[PDB]
Amino acid sequence: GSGFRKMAFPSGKVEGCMVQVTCGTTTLNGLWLDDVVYCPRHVICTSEDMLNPNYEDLLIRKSNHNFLVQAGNVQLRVIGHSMQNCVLKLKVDTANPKTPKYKFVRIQPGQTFSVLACYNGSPSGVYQCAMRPNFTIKGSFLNGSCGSVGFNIDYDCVSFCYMHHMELPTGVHAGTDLEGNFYGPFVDRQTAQAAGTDTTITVNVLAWLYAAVINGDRWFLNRFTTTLNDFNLVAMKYNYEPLTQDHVDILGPLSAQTGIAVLDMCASLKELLQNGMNGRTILGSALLEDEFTPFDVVRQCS
Amino acid sequence: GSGFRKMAFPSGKVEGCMVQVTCGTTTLNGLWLDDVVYCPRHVICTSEDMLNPNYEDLLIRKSNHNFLVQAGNVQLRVIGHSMQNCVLKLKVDTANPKTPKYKFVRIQPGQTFSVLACYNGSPSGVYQCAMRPNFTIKGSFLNGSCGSVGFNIDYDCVSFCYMHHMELPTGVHAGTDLEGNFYGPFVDRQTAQAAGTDTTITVNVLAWLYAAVINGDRWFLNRFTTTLNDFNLVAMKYNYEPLTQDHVDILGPLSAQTGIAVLDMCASLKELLQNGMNGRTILGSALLEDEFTPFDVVRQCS
Numbered sequence: 219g220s221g222f223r224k225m226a227f228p229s230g231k232v233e234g235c236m237v238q239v240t241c242g243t244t245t246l247n248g249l250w251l252d253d254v255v256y257c258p259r260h261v262i263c264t265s266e267d268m269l270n271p272n273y274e275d276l277l278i279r280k281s282n283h284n285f286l287v288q289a290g291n292v293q294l295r296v297i298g299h300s301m302q303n304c305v306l307k308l309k310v311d312t313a314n315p316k317t318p319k320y321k322f323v324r325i326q327p328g329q330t331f332s333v334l335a336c337y338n339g340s341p342s343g344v345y346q347c348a349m350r351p352n353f354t355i356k357g358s359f360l361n362g363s364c365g366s367v368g369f370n371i372d373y374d375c376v377s378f379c380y381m382h383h384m385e386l387p388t389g390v391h392a393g394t395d396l397e398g399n400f401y402g403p404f405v406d407r408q409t410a411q412a413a414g415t416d417t418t419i420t421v422n423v424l425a426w427l428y429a430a431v432i433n434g435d436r437w438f439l440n441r442f443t444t445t446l447n448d449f450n451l452v453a454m455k456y457n458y459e460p461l462t463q464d465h466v467d468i469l470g471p472l473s474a475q476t477g478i479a480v481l482d483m484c485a486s487l488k489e490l491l492q493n494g495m496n497g498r499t500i501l502g503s504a505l506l507e508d509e510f511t512p513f514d515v516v517r518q519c520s
Numbered sequence: 521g522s523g524f525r526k527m528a529f530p531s532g533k534v535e536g537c538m539v540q541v542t543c544g545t546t547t548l549n550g551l552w553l554d555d556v557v558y559c560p561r562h563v564i565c566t567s568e569d570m571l572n573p574n575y576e577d578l579l580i581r582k583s584n585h586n587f588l589v590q591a592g593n594v595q596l597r598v599i600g601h602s603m604q605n606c607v608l609k610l611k612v613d614t615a616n617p618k619t620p621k622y623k624f625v626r627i628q629p630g631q632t633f634s635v636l637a638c639y640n641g642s643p644s645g646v647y648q649c650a651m652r653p654n655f656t657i658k659g660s661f662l663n664g665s666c667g668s669v670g671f672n673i674d675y676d677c678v679s680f681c682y683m684h685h686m687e688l689p690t691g692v693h694a695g696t697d698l699e700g701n702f703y704g705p706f707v708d709r710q711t712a713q714a715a716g717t718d719t720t721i722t723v724n725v726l727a728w729l730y731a732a733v734i735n736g737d738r739w740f741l742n743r744f745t746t747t748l749n750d751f752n753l754v755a756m757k758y759n760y761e762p763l764t765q766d767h768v769d770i771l772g773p774l775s776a777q778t779g780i781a782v783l784d785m786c787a788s789l790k791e792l793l794q795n796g797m798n799g800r801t802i803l804g805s806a807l808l809e810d811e812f813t814p815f816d817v818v819r820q821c822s
């Protein structure tokens with residue numbers, strides 16, 4: 219009721235769409251919706267192609283009949299293929315009977331989603347992640363994970379937002395939306411790529427402070443307010459992400475529920491940043507949590 | 521390498537089993553396997569009853585027609601009912617086509633499982649919990665969550681280990697196995713109930729220290745070793761469970777993968793208990809985490 223546990227969405231509706239896609243001996247995960255399978259285009263790369271592939275040229279050598287698509291051990295015959303940015307669309311001869319109501323959405327930095335981690339078309343586990351401000355995710359992914367998807371569920375409709383492509387040297391992860399456009403500055407090639415410096419997701423820290431208040435932990439409230447501009451300028455000095463107008467908007471329901479204005483909570487956070495945690499804790503921890511969204515708090519705390 | 525997240529089992533095989541069970545104005549969740557629906561017996565209760573319910577009496581006072589079972593928006597027909605401890609078994613006349621392979625297990629304290637949180641028969645979220653040494657679980661359960669289940673998945677077999685009954689005043693949770701026997705000293709009546717004192721699950725803290733090493737977080741390591749007995753003396757002083765030789769053996773794979781002997785890792789943990797974490801974090805946490813088992817770590821980190 220107030221465990222503030224990271225909670226994933228139930229994965230069944232996505233489990234019902236996971237397939238494997240093979241070229242030669244390279245097998246990736248794909249997403250089967252209606253009569254189309256979406257997967258990372260680099261399923262077509264050999265070891266020698268991967269360092270700087272010419273995807274257009276590599277694809278020229280591929281026919282429908284070189285792609286093995288399987289649902290478990292059942293083959294789906296490919297009847298068409300095209301490349302859209304960094305994903306392959308394979309048209310197949312069978313419409314997925316388990317296709318949920320779905321959309322493809324591009325998530326915003328700081329938003330969260332569930333990841334269904336899959337190996338050889340086979341679901342291994344589900345966890346919740348945030349899209350960091352530098353457009354990486356702190357996932358958990360082994361060899362074989364590429365094509366695993368991230369999603370949100372809204373009353374029976376699955377919003378697909380992420381497909382996995384890459385691990386960076388820092389151990390973080392990078393990927394695309396379901397139209398194949400990378401989040402952040404990354405490219406699908408076998409190089410060491412550097413992420414921007416990561417920042418704290420301010421909007422989620424504020425959600426967490428609201429959640430603390432809702433559960434009666436409110437020692438850190440002060441009597442002051444701030445302007446949004448002033449707060450944002452101070453936030454950046456502490457490696458906190460500035461608030462957007464969307465962020466202020468989504469804290470509105472939590473503001474209404476506690477009666478504490480968004481900018482009063484910002485002024486309370488501002489004092490915690492400047493004065494430190496005093497020694498004390500909040501909902502148990504001396505660490506401020508930044509991967510609980512306003513929506514997550516609303517969903518699991520009121 | 522992998523990264524490291526609190527990971528639940530894909531919940532699809534359990535979502536296909538969830539139904540809604542109503543008796544009077546009480547609605548909760550049931551689990552529909554073959555031609556039986558399992559749910560918490562106190563669906564049969566109205567308000568007065570709930571303080572000192574005589575369940576045998578209450579159950580003989582019901583007929584099959586009093587039980588409204590719904591799968592989606594299709595009423596199932598109840599043709600039979602019995603009671604097994606705190607669980608009600610409703611025989612229906614239609615078998616569940618999505619019934620997975622399953623068994624019913626009673627887990628030991630320290631073991632983890634996934635919880636599919638449900639409301640009105642509808643899956644809402646999934647998360648990973650551990651059975652605490654005081655037989656509570658730290659979940660996120662609200663009104664309407666009763667009948668939600670916990671489970672592990674073992675090679676396409678679902679092991680059901682938990683059904684949800686109660687929130688304690690402290691905000692932790694209590695429930696039964698699928699045989700209807702409570703974990704811990706709790707009772708299904710409408711009263712405020714305290715738990716015994718909790719302890720930290722030491723074998724899990726060690727597994728998580730191994731996960732930290734595998735993911736490149738090493739500051740807490742030291743050159744020392746301890747005996748198992750001396751480790752246990754200190755552990756028990758700090759309210760940590762004793763580590764058995766069986767625990768040592770189960771950490772073997774992670775020991776091998778990292779080249780850190782179990783009793784070396786115990787010396788690290790002893791220094792963390794005595795000296796604290798001195799402002800640093802491990803895998804982003806400022807507290808020692810005890811809700812990953814050795815198997816959880818192995819399965820996730822190779």
Ligand SMILES: *[C@@](O)(c1nc2c(F)cccc2s1)[C@H](C[C@@H]1CCNC1=O)NC(=O)[C@H](CC(C)C)NC(=O)c1cc2c(OC)ccc(F)c2[nH]1
Binds near residue numbers: 263268361384410
């Ligand atoms: C995928 O699972 C993919 N694996 C393959 C494959 F084996 C053959 C062809 C295509 C693909 S996609 C994998 C997921 C990684 C694996 C480790 N944890 C992960 O999340 N993605 C990769 O292996 C990608 C593949 C490119 C998109 C073509 N490469 C990297 O993630 C990668 C390469 C790197 C180098 O190269 C010199 C240096 C440092 C580095 F951090 C790095 N990362």
Ligand SMILES: *[C@@](O)(c1nc2c(F)cccc2s1)[C@H](C[C@@H]1CCNC1=O)NC(=O)[C@H](CC(C)C)NC(=O)c1cc2c(OC)ccc(F)c2[nH]1
Binds near residue numbers: 546565665666707
């Ligand atoms: C269930 O979902 C159930 N709800 C009902 C119900 F509304 C009517 C009849 C039967 C049931 S089972 C719910 C889950 C709880 C609700 C809050 N968060 C949860 O996880 N379980 C309960 O409400 C149980 C029911 C008993 C088993 C009979 N009761 C408690 O959890 C409960 C009762 C408490 C009191 O009673 C005076 C005091 C303090 C307290 F913390 C407490 N908890």
